[PDB]
Amino acid sequence: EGRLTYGGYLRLDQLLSAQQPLSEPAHHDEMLFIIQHQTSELWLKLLAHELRAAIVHLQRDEVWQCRKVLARSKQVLRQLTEQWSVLETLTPSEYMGFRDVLGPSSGFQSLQYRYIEFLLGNKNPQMLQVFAYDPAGQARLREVLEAPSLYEEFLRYLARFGHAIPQQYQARDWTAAHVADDTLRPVFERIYENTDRYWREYSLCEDLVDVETQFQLWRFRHMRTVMRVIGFKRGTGGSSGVGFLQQALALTFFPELFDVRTSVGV
């Protein structure tokens, strides 16, 4: 159909022909497994689309626009987090009926997910290997890898307005994951200590805290779902499974924002 019809515009012939279970005979629960991932991948694509715009707004000092885009980003992350409730209706007995059809593949190979991790700041050049089979996508990942993260662009925004931001944030090896910077503590303390004056900065700090918290919630529900489905069995990717996902919850995108809590109003 033409791009002006409902199905043609949405390219449903292509979208709705992408569900191909491998189990033989076809296991009833494999459709859920596939759709759970595909809906997530679509939301991740939208999330990346929105986050990229949030970065551009920050670079241009467009605060309200940045916040609006981040508001939608939070709603998308919330859908990604809420949907785990569907997959939790998948029991170990059902999963073991087709887990074998799956190869040594895993979410590790999710290009879109890695894209988000990179955009938020959890850079990992060593992650470019898993996508060696695909140079095209690998290239797009490299771009974000070599560019300032959402968090670093926020720091650059603060720098443009006279905040005491270290000179290194003007230019450095962006491919290296951000490391907790103690010198940023006084910067955020000032913001939280005078919110009427630094309302723009204050609102953005809380938006970032919201984003990270929602992301961690996604990681937690992910881990808990894996736990109830495969328990402590090793993952098809090669990790310890739950153990590895448990360590992921220890990661932090915006450490200084959480650390400042300990000194606010001291």
Add this chain to the structure above:
Amino acid sequence: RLTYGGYLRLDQLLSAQQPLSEPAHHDEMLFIIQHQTSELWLKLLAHELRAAIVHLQRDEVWQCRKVLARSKQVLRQLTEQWSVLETLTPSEYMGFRDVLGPSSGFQSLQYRYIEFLLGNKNPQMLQVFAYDPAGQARLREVLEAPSLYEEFLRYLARFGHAIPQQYQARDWTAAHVADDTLRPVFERIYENTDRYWREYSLCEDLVDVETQFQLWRFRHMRTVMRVIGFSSGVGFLQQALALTFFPELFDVRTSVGVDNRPPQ
């Protein structure tokens, strides 16, 4: 097949987002993805509802309930996701709505499948799918088969319930009409849950499914209202809220009351 992206056919899935606006409008991606995620969930919902029907045809109560439990969760995601589209403002929509066609989800085959399966049969709807004789035939099969509700009634008939003989054979293509003779049947079930726990649990599962479906319809309407404002249009969506899949289940609420409980 062997890799994450290969198994999930992501090259195909992630190349299905093609905005028409040019210069490309930032908010068109949301418009597309909002529909596509919904279509994927609707496909899963049909997959599960078909299984629920099979379980009823096999007198498999707990299995039917488990499948319906997942169905409720899928309907819940479809309902909750409207919150994302609510961030689409009139200012943003007016920037790309002009390049879009004049259709809506009214043209969704997957959605019509759900309506049909639940019992809201409409032979006239087959016309809109004339362009697709394949999907038209696939939809006609559901149209000619008993709905999820009618299969529940047939299940009840197989176990002593006073289900009218008409439910054994009739023109299933016609949408179910409220049957007052079913009132005593549901009253007996709700008035003796200790004995009719299977039937009672299924009745409540159906009420859950319909209620969640109505919530989807309401959130849909409220989202459309805040985007384009106020048959067809939002008026048609308002009328959809007056539709009911399992009327007798809601009607029985007004007459249940016999107390068959033992000494307490």
Add this chain to the structure above:
Amino acid sequence: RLTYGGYLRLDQLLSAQQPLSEPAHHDEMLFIIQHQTSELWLKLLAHELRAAIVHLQRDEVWQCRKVLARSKQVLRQLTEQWSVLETLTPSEYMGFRDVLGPSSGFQSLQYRYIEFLLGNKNPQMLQVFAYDPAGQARLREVLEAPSLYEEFLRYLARFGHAIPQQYQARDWTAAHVADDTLRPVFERIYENTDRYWREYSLCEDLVDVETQFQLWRFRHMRTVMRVIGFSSGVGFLQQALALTFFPELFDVRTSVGVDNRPPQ
């Protein structure tokens, strides 16, 4: 004050659940707690909405938005919690509904406060609170004061917007009537968000608040429908869905369209 239970006054709070059924019916506790949690949330909502009004009176936009953000979250909890009551079946309710009085949340003072604050003023409602002259007077104060919406309009008037002079002084006890002269005002705001971002963001916050409130009304109605089935009754709840707090905000959707964007 010094201890957890003392500070939260739990001895008082947790001794307020007194079922009337005897023998006590297991499901009456839910009925009570469902109402009490809602009343607590409504109290917080009034607390926040009052603050939102103060911020508008002080031209404090970001503060108003932050308070409204919390208000939306409170309304969301009030809406989501209906899922708990949906597990109350007709079979269970018929076991204790007889000992209950003939009233409903229509008699909720806290709820009426919210309706009034949002603009749905009704002097006649003061009568139902005649038994409580104190609460009647506290409610009358909100009745005689500009609503959250009218304070938003007054804020707009202070900054060059073509707000009618009538909004400077009038009988606030009367519910706001749809004003077509406000259409060009909101069109200008939505057609130049780069300049009117403050106004644009507040307009959308109000649409969010009203939409979430309507979702609460809908879930309320659907829950009542599945418990007791189908002016007064569910018919009255159905009519409540036709009420609107900020009509002009929804109406402008049908006429926005001027494109003031720079070259792109």
Add this chain to the structure above:
Amino acid sequence: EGRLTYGGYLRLDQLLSAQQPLSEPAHHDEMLFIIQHQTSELWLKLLAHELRAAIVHLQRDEVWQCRKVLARSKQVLRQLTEQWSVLETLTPSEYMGFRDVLGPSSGFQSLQYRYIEFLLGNKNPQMLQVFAYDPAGQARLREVLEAPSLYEEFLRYLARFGHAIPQQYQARDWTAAHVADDTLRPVFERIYENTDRYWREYSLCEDLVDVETQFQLWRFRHMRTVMRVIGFKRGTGGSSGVGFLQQALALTFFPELFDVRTSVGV
């Protein structure tokens, strides 16, 4: 008003006069702080009410009734978990405006919460000390402490139907928290390996997994909220704060149910 009026039935004069902020002047955000806890305490009271009934149903082999009560229990836990989203709008700058008015009190002193923990199996006789000031409530906690938990009643249910349940579960020191029992693995493996036959047991196992998962989600959101409000500052109760809440996520009510995942369909 009489118990037949709306306000009289719900005892609103008493319920709505229980919000007494201590800050001076009255801090705007203290009302949220109080109401957030009071709504939670009301849901916890309902949860305990429902869980007690679930236990009675299990003792009487009333499976569908038990499941229905657990379904409502899950919905209540979901409300308790979802509401954290309201409290997350409370920033460090707002909280520090009245955190001082609060004494050395903490959720540790929540009798209703401890009641739930005990009912689920996380027994701790040493926790009877914190409620020494209140012998009345302390007594009610002791009852559940000395009685079989929800999980142990499930095991006793399985025992009544011929499942290979250890004799110790017929009578033992219930005040002692349940310890992971390896001998239960074969019992749950059999259930998950033949769900058509053991559908009753299967459904109950999944209900318990649902309950524990939802409870852990509550613990996680609790911890994340504390993290964004007070950061890594020590709690008013006396613990490390986030660190302590982090260890709480390591606790498990029904270990055998999660451990069996590793051997299901081996």
